[PDB]
Design an enzyme around this catalytic site. Structure first.
Site, PDB file in Angstrom:
ATOM      1  N   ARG A  76      -7.872  12.130  10.379  1.00 58.17           N
ATOM      2  CA  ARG A  76      -9.201  12.649  10.675  1.00 58.17           C
ATOM      3  C   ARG A  76     -10.139  11.591  11.249  1.00 58.17           C
ATOM      4  NH1 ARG A  76     -12.968  10.931   7.320  1.00 58.17           N
ATOM      5  NH2 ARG A  76     -12.169   9.865   5.452  1.00 58.17           N
ATOM      6  N   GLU A 111       0.822  -1.172   0.000  1.00 56.01           N
ATOM      7  CA  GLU A 111       0.000   0.000   0.000  1.00 56.01           C
ATOM      8  C   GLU A 111       0.880   1.254   0.000  1.00 56.01           C
ATOM      9  OE1 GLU A 111      -1.772   1.350   3.581  1.00 56.01           O
ATOM     10  OE2 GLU A 111      -3.630   1.897   2.519  1.00 56.01           O
ATOM     11  N   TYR A 128      -4.822   9.483  -2.160  1.00 56.52           N
ATOM     12  CA  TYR A 128      -3.435   9.733  -1.712  1.00 56.52           C
ATOM     13  C   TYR A 128      -2.343   9.829  -2.804  1.00 56.52           C
ATOM     14  CZ  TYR A 128      -5.860   7.845   2.453  1.00 56.52           C
ATOM     15  OH  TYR A 128      -6.811   7.523   3.402  1.00 56.52           O
ATOM     16  N   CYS A 184      -7.970   9.535   5.095  1.00 52.37           N
ATOM     17  CA  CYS A 184      -8.011   9.488   6.553  1.00 52.37           C
ATOM     18  C   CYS A 184      -6.764  10.085   7.168  1.00 52.37           C
ATOM     19  CB  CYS A 184      -8.180   8.054   7.042  1.00 52.37           C
ATOM     20  SG  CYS A 184      -9.730   7.312   6.453  1.00 52.37           S
ATOM     21  N   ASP A 242     -10.045   4.066  12.344  1.00 52.61           N
ATOM     22  CA  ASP A 242     -10.594   2.728  12.588  1.00 52.61           C
ATOM     23  C   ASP A 242      -9.540   2.050  13.442  1.00 52.61           C
ATOM     24  OD1 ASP A 242     -11.082  -0.083  12.536  1.00 52.61           O
ATOM     25  OD2 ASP A 242     -11.918  -0.016  10.522  1.00 52.61           O
ATOM     26  N   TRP A 255      -8.100  -2.207  -0.151  1.00 55.11           N
ATOM     27  CA  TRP A 255      -8.815  -1.109  -0.843  1.00 55.11           C
ATOM     28  C   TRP A 255      -9.966  -1.617  -1.712  1.00 55.11           C
ATOM     29  CZ3 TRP A 255      -9.273   3.794   0.379  1.00 55.11           C
ATOM     30  CH2 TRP A 255      -8.289   4.334   1.242  1.00 55.11           C
TER      31      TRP A 255
HETATM   32  N1  LIG Z   1     -13.576   0.946   7.920  1.00 52.93           N
HETATM   33  C1  LIG Z   1     -12.406   1.139   7.267  1.00 52.93           C
HETATM   34  N2  LIG Z   1     -11.267   1.090   7.991  1.00 52.93           N
HETATM   35  C2  LIG Z   1     -10.048   1.300   7.397  1.00 52.93           C
HETATM   36  O1  LIG Z   1      -9.000   1.275   8.103  1.00 52.93           O
HETATM   37  C3  LIG Z   1      -9.998   1.554   5.927  1.00 52.93           C
HETATM   38  C4  LIG Z   1      -9.014   1.802   4.961  1.00 52.93           C
HETATM   39  C5  LIG Z   1      -7.526   1.866   5.234  1.00 52.93           C
HETATM   40  C6  LIG Z   1      -6.747   0.723   4.609  1.00 52.93           C
HETATM   41  C7  LIG Z   1      -7.007  -0.642   5.248  1.00 52.93           C
HETATM   42  C8  LIG Z   1      -8.123  -1.358   4.824  1.00 52.93           C
HETATM   43  C9  LIG Z   1      -8.404  -2.616   5.340  1.00 52.93           C
HETATM   44  C10 LIG Z   1      -7.562  -3.172   6.301  1.00 52.93           C
HETATM   45  C11 LIG Z   1      -7.900  -4.558   6.759  1.00 52.93           C
HETATM   46  O2  LIG Z   1      -8.949  -5.048   6.364  1.00 52.93           O
HETATM   47  N3  LIG Z   1      -6.996  -5.252   7.432  1.00 52.93           N
HETATM   48  C12 LIG Z   1      -7.208  -6.619   7.906  1.00 52.93           C
HETATM   49  C13 LIG Z   1      -6.712  -7.653   6.861  1.00 52.93           C
HETATM   50  C14 LIG Z   1      -5.313  -7.332   6.364  1.00 52.93           C
HETATM   51  C15 LIG Z   1      -4.787  -8.312   5.336  1.00 52.93           C
HETATM   52  O3  LIG Z   1      -4.814  -9.535   5.596  1.00 52.93           O
HETATM   53  O4  LIG Z   1      -4.305  -7.863   4.269  1.00 52.93           O
HETATM   54  C16 LIG Z   1      -6.453  -6.821   9.195  1.00 52.93           C
HETATM   55  O5  LIG Z   1      -6.775  -7.813   9.860  1.00 52.93           O
HETATM   56  O6  LIG Z   1      -5.538  -6.028   9.541  1.00 52.93           O
HETATM   57  C17 LIG Z   1      -6.435  -2.468   6.754  1.00 52.93           C
HETATM   58  C18 LIG Z   1      -6.158  -1.186   6.227  1.00 52.93           C
HETATM   59  C19 LIG Z   1      -9.659   1.959   3.729  1.00 52.93           C
HETATM   60  N4  LIG Z   1     -11.015   1.835   3.947  1.00 52.93           N
HETATM   61  C20 LIG Z   1     -11.207   1.575   5.266  1.00 52.93           C
HETATM   62  N5  LIG Z   1     -12.390   1.374   5.919  1.00 52.93           N
HETATM   63  O1  LIG Z   2      -5.899   4.912   6.310  1.00 56.73           O
HETATM   64  C1  LIG Z   2      -7.022   4.837   6.805  1.00 56.73           C
HETATM   65  C2  LIG Z   2      -8.156   4.996   6.019  1.00 56.73           C
HETATM   66  C3  LIG Z   2      -9.435   4.921   6.605  1.00 56.73           C
HETATM   67  N1  LIG Z   2      -9.543   4.711   7.966  1.00 56.73           N
HETATM   68  C4  LIG Z   2     -10.875   4.514   8.563  1.00 56.73           C
HETATM   69  C5  LIG Z   2     -11.548   5.610   9.371  1.00 56.73           C
HETATM   70  C6  LIG Z   2     -13.015   5.190   9.222  1.00 56.73           C
HETATM   71  O2  LIG Z   2     -13.315   4.124  10.134  1.00 56.73           O
HETATM   72  C7  LIG Z   2     -13.058   4.682   7.785  1.00 56.73           C
HETATM   73  C8  LIG Z   2     -13.360   5.798   6.797  1.00 56.73           C
HETATM   74  O3  LIG Z   2     -14.695   6.237   6.929  1.00 56.73           O
HETATM   75  P1  LIG Z   2     -15.038   7.827   6.957  1.00 56.73           P
HETATM   76  O4  LIG Z   2     -14.328   8.438   8.154  1.00 56.73           O
HETATM   77  O5  LIG Z   2     -14.547   8.531   5.741  1.00 56.73           O
HETATM   78  O6  LIG Z   2     -16.525   7.945   7.101  1.00 56.73           O
HETATM   79  O7  LIG Z   2     -11.747   4.190   7.501  1.00 56.73           O
HETATM   80  C9  LIG Z   2      -8.399   4.513   8.731  1.00 56.73           C
HETATM   81  O8  LIG Z   2      -8.489   4.283   9.932  1.00 56.73           O
HETATM   82  N2  LIG Z   2      -7.144   4.599   8.153  1.00 56.73           N
END
Ligand SMILES: Nc1nc(=O)c2c(CCc3ccc(C(=O)N[C@@H](CCC(=O)O)C(=O)O)cc3)c[nH]c2[nH]1
Ligand SMILES: O=c1ccn([C@H]2C[C@H](O)[C@@H](COP(=O)(O)O)O2)c(=O)[nH]1
Ligand SMILES: NC(=O)c1ccc[n+]([C@@H]2O[C@H](COP(=O)([O-])OP(=O)(O)OC[C@H]3O[C@@H](n4cnc5c(N)ncnc54)[C@H](OP(=O)(O)O)[C@@H]3O)[C@@H](O)[C@H]2O)c1
Ligand SMILES: NC(=O)c1ccc[n+]([C@@H]2O[C@H](COP(=O)([O-])OP(=O)(O)OC[C@H]3O[C@@H](n4cnc5c(N)ncnc54)[C@H](OP(=O)(O)O)[C@@H]3O)[C@@H](O)[C@H]2O)c1
Ligand SMILES: Nc1nc(=O)c2c(CCc3ccc(C(=O)N[C@@H](CCC(=O)O)C(=O)O)cc3)c[nH]c2[nH]1
Ligand SMILES: Nc1nc(=O)c2c(CCc3ccc(C(=O)N[C@@H](CCC(=O)O)C(=O)O)cc3)c[nH]c2[nH]1
Ligand SMILES: Nc1nc(=O)c2c(CCc3ccc(C(=O)N[C@@H](CCC(=O)O)C(=O)O)cc3)c[nH]c2[nH]1
Ligand SMILES: O=c1ccn([C@H]2C[C@H](O)[C@@H](COP(=O)(O)O)O2)c(=O)[nH]1
Lengths: 503, 503
Positions: free
Chosen positions: B405, B277, B325, B385, B408, B299
């Site tokens: 901002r 990533e 990004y 984010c 998660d 993604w």
């Molecule tokens: N809600 C939400 N939260 C986010 O952090 C996020 C992102 C950031 C990138 C991101 C997305 C998924 C996982 C993820 O799924 N990780 C898992 C599996 C990792 C793997 O096996 O590749 C984990 O267990 O860490 C880890 C990081 C985009 N959209 C999102 N939406």
């Molecule tokens: O790099 C990232 C990208 C996204 N998010 C999380 C924050 C939210 O849980 C979700 C995005 O939803 P919104 O905040 O845009 O509604 O993904 C992360 O923690 N890290």
């Protein structure tokens, strides 16, 4: 004469003009929070003492006049031995009565099982206690306002110092806090040192804000501590101004805006200038003359002819600061011409957008106003220092986080803290929201060399309770606030401290 | 047998496969930091005890072989009474010698004035001490690498728990920390409570990470504490995804990148996905297929047909995420057409500009890459984010601060922490700089309802020492890093914890 009569502990609430009583009544409207603090302070029994004697109580001592200052609803004071000093009454329901203090204390400590004796006034009694050195500790509620009165708390002797300061609180009529004074002359396990994995002999920092204050709950300590930390551990770096500064990276402060207004009290801060600057940001102005015209000179130096020319801005009108804060808040993305152009309906009105979104979608996670417009940076007299802020709503309270890339601790930071606190309050009001927190991130935090003596002096100053903010409740739109709509009440501060701005 | 022989305190250094010795020598290259920790732990005398007997020393006890294992020059160990156990040697210059442990401890505690007894091995001695319950405390240096050897530390009985953890340290050959175990069955003034000005009896938080650990110096604790804090005090709010989340606003974490690499150990983190990533951001890509093609699916849910459609992106090709990004890092201000367009020489290459500014003007205070391009937000499948980061240089070390901002905490935060640490190390390397800190500001920090069980499990897990990062030192340009140039060594972690993403 007073053998065995010492270590008497005072509880008192005192107005700014030292008044404590008016026509045998409390001079201000009741602060029930103060009553609970007094109750909690005077009732406390240590666990160890209480398990040995579970019926043990503290003593409270009053003059008769103070005793009537209290309702029946709360009299005699529950769970404490009540004692009244008087030469004119013999008996009182629920109380012990003595003719004078020295008799009282002696009788008490010889014949009446108790834990601790507290002194609850009034002036006669407090004066006797202090003139005779009988007090080792004072619990004092500080009210930041003068009240009419006829009964005063005596001056506390220079033998005492403030050792604890609570957070500032407020009702809608006064701001206040709680402090502890103690008599100076009677005022770290090894694993903790080893388990850092670093030097076990770590020399204490060179600079410490208010060394005598051990309980440091006033939010101003955050700012004072940071000052002390950059002076202690900051690295002297050259910078764009050509005046060097001691610099350190990464801090986070927070201020509870429901309680008080974080206008620094350790120096007199130019509030008028902060308010005019904010109103200037809100209306979207980038014309420095708009501030000069209002006798505010904080932006003068970065719009001066020589500063502009020094930085390549040779076709820029003096005080045309370029597309900085005001322009980005209201017209992000619009093409900047000069500070006279009509930008109406051009670019993105972040300020309006985000206020409307707070109303319609409070749980949105993108409530951001961003002034770091990368495309506009080269046109700016000075790229935004507070370059990004974000709002947040939970439980019907607005909070705000601001990112400050570059933080002039002596001059701008105090302005920044107060400015964003006002903006949050304004935004909260137009959205019908209560007040949460302002969270201030400092990235490059520095103290200019020529501010060192200034800030050294400043961090030795004991903070006063913060003031409180009142906005005119009738203002329905952020664009309508005028300077008369924004009132800071009960501001008590130390003297101004001159510091020159490095352009 | 062992009456009066208890409360013996162990110091040991242990490899990941429990090995402590090899051919009667230390199995690893010497860690002088560990020797210094040992020396400090074993020479400490409490100040009170020292004044009464200013020549008092502690005891260190070894087996014959472990003594023979230290240089004859460094021995006897300075400022302590050295004791050797042996059935084949009777006299050793400047040591005491006993035939067995029970005799030794008895003789010492009855007849040899001293402060505390330490046990420094080897296995025969550690085993006897543990098998017989003679130890109440263990100082244990954890090494995250397996070493060849023939001597092992016994398993620590479940009557012990870890009560202290140092920060993670590293050499160029191993990651390590210090911990204290204590025997479970034998392991604040009122002013502090009153002077908050709030409720004096505070209901303890509902969730606490690793309640057993009292000295919490491992940087992972910042993250675990924040999980515990949001579970405890966060507000349950709806959000864009339709899965609710407990949410709390405003935190700051920091990670010392010169010491270790902050890849969480309380669960097995998908590091390969984090690297790909980041490499994807760097090359400026906004094509989700570029990630899927590397078998990274993080993604995927935000580029999917249904997600695009339901957010009005009905004309957008699947996995065209828009100007997020990669596009903002390399082309801020260019007009985004789609993910296939050639953007060469269009927009501002923030990443290139900042790396070059770090080289030429390290004291600039505008070292910022900003992905919150307000003009482009409506084109974005998911607005950034981690939307803004800023570098800083002092003492020839690069630090980084990032503003997130929306956080998660279950899924993304662990990714963001490690991602920016790698990015900082990369930028540091191409600019010839050492490593400072990554400072992580969290705005809306939340835990989705379907992650509660997962994170509840996670916060009870005792963190392992963090791993360390090695970049291929030949890499001179940030665009040249490939997955094989970025190596995390000595990663030790608890099991992965499945957690589902809310789109
Ligand atoms: N809600 C939400 N939260 C986010 O952090 C996020 C992102 C950031 C990138 C991101 C997305 C998924 C996982 C993820 O799924 N990780 C898992 C599996 C990792 C793997 O096996 O590749 C984990 O267990 O860490 C880890 C990081 C985009 N959209 C999102 N939406
Ligand atoms: O790099 C990232 C990208 C996204 N998010 C999380 C924050 C939210 O849980 C979700 C995005 O939803 P919104 O905040 O845009 O509604 O993904 C992360 O923690 N890290
Ligand atoms: N804000 C606060 O924290 C606070 C605290 C306390 C009081 N107050 C206010 O202060 C006012 C009361 O104070 P005050 O100074 O007017 O009166 P006071 O000190 O409460 O009482 C005065 C009387 O008490 C007796 N007395 C005091 N010390 C004595 C001693 N050593 N020996 C014998 N008698 C002694 C005498 O009464 P006799 O006439 O019986 O001889 C004296 O005339 C009220 O208005 C009250 O609300 C405010
Ligand atoms: N990394 C670490 O923390 C650490 C710590 C300690 C040791 N080590 C390593 O471990 C190795 C040495 O340990 P080891 O287990 O081989 O040997 P050891 O326990 O140090 O010593 C072996 C000898 O000690 C004697 N001994 C131990 N307990 C005794 C008792 N109760 N009564 C009588 N004698 C007793 C015996 O004596 P005789 O044979 O003399 O009669 C035995 O043969 C070395 O490689 C060293 O580097 C590592
Ligand atoms: N800090 C401070 N504030 C004061 O007003 C004060 C006074 C004024 C006299 C006074 C004493 C008790 C109460 C009284 O009603 N006390 C009740 C509290 C009621 C409650 O909160 O439940 C009590 O139980 O102590 C009200 C007034 C002396 N020392 C003081 N110190
Ligand atoms: N180097 C530097 N630092 C900054 O903080 C800054 C700013 C922020 C705005 C600013 C500028 C000057 C003063 C200021 O001078 N305040 C004085 C006088 C206030 C008054 O009299 O109105 C103070 O003592 O607070 C207070 C605030 C713009 N350019 C700057 N350049
Ligand atoms: N944590 C830990 N690490 C170890 O290697 C170890 C050992 C191995 C034996 C051992 C004992 C002392 C020193 C030794 O030389 N000690 C000197 C250090 C000198 C210095 O660094 O200043 C000392 O003075 O203690 C070196 C090796 C037992 N318990 C240990 N525990
Ligand atoms: O609102 C502001 C604006 C500016 N500054 C300070 C930070 C620096 O001391 C100086 C700006 O110089 P640069 O960081 O841009 O070089 O002004 C503030 O503290 N607050």
């Amino acid at each position: 004469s007073y053998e065995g009569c010492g270590d008497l502990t005072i509880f008192v609430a005192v107005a700014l003009n030292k008044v404590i009583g008016h026509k045998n009544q409390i001079p201000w409207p009741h602060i029930t929070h103060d009553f609970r603090f007094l109750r909690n302070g005077t009732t406390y029994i240590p666990p160890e003492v209480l398990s040995k004697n579970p019926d043990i109580q503290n003593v409270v001592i009053f003059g008769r006049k103070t005793y009537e200052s209290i309702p029946k609803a709360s009299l005699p004071l529950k769970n404490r031995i009540n004692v009244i000093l008087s030469r004119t009454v013999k008996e009182v329901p629920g109380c012990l009565v003595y003719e004078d203090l020295s008799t009282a204390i002696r009788d008490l400590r010889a014949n009446v099982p108790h834990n601790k004796i507290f002194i609850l006034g009034g002036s006669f009694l407090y004066k006797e206690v202090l003139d005779n050195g009988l007090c080792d500790k004072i619990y004092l509620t500080r009210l930041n306002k003068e009240y009419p009165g006829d009964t005063y708390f005596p001056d506390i002797p220079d033998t005492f110092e403030i050792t604890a300061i609570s957070p500032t609180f407020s009702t809608d009529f006064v701001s206040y806090d709680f402090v502890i004074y103690e008599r100076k002359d009677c005022k770290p396990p090894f694993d903790q040192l080893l388990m850092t994995g670093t030097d076990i002999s770590v020399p204490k920092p060179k600079y410490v804000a208010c060394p005598g204050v051990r309980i440091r709950n006033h939010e101003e300590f955050q700012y004072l501590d940071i000052l002390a930390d950059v002076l202690s551990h900051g690295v002297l770096k050259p910078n764009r101004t050509g005046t060097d500064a001691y610099s350190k990276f990464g801090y986070q402060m927070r201020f509870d805006l429901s309680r008080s207004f974080p206008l620094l009290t350790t120096k007199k801060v130019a509030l008028r200038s902060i308010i005019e600057e904010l109103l200037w940001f809100i209306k979207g102005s980038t014309n420095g003359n708009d501030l000069l015209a209002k006798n505010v000179r904080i932006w003068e130096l970065n719009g001066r002819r020589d500063f502009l020319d020094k930085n390549g801005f040779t076709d820029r009108e003096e005080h045309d600061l370029g597309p900085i804060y005001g322009f980005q808040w209201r017209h992000f993305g619009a093409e900047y011409l000069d500070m006279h152009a009509d930008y109406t309906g051009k670019g993105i009105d972040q300020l309006a957008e985000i206020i409307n979104r707070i109303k319609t979608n409070p749980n949105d996670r993108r409530l951001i106003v961003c002034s770091w417009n990368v495309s506009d940076l080269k046109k700016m007299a000075l790229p935004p220092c507070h370059c990004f802020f974000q709002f947040y709503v939970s439980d019907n309270k607005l909070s705000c986080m601001m990112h400050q890339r570059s933080c002039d601790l002596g001059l701008g930071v105090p302005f920044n803290i107060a400015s964003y606190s006002i903006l949050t309050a304004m935004v909260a009001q137009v959205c019908g929201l209560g007040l949460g927190e302002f969270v201030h991130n400092l990235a490059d935090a520095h103290i200019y060399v020529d501010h060192v003596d200034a800030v050294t002096t400043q961090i030795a100053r004991i903070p006063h309770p913060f003031p409180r903010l009142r906005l005119n409740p009738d203002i329905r739109n952020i664009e309508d606030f005028t300077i008369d709509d924004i009132v800071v009440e009960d501001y008590v501060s130390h003297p101004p401290i001159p510091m020159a701005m490095s352009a």
